[PDB]
Amino acid sequence: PIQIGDLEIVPDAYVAKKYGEELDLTHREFELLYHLASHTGQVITREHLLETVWGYDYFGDVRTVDVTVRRLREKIEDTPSRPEYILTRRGVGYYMRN
Numbered sequence: 001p002i003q004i005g006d007l008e009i010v011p012d013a014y015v016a017k018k019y020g021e022e023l024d025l026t027h028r029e030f031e032l033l034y035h036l037a038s039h040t041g042q043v044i045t046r047e048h049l050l051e052t053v054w055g056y057d058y059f060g061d062v063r064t065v066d067v068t069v070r071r072l073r074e075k076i077e078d079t080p081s082r083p084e085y086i087l088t089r090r091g092v093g094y095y096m097r098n
């Protein structure tokens with residue numbers, strides 16, 4: 001389990017909580033969230049997130065990652081337009097705050 005600010009990720013139960021309340025994430029949104037929080041503040045490229053979270057039938061289409069991050073941000077960020085949990089590293093990828 002991972003606790004970051006007001007966010008808690010429970011891998012064994014596939015649940016994410018914000019202010020202690022279970023969030024309504026798709027399986028893919030949870031796996032993205034968990035994958036990001038599992039690298040713990042290291043930057044992950046879009047291609048890397050595709051290969052691990054989506055898989056082979058998704059090789060070229062990095063835009064799926066950006067679309068899913070935006071949807072995840074709307075669900076977990078206090079201010080989705082100024083995110084604090086899921087962070088962008090310009091031109092390389094995404095990472096979870098330390």
Ligand SMILES: [Zn+2]
Nearest residue numbers: 035039048052
């Ligand atoms: Zn990884």
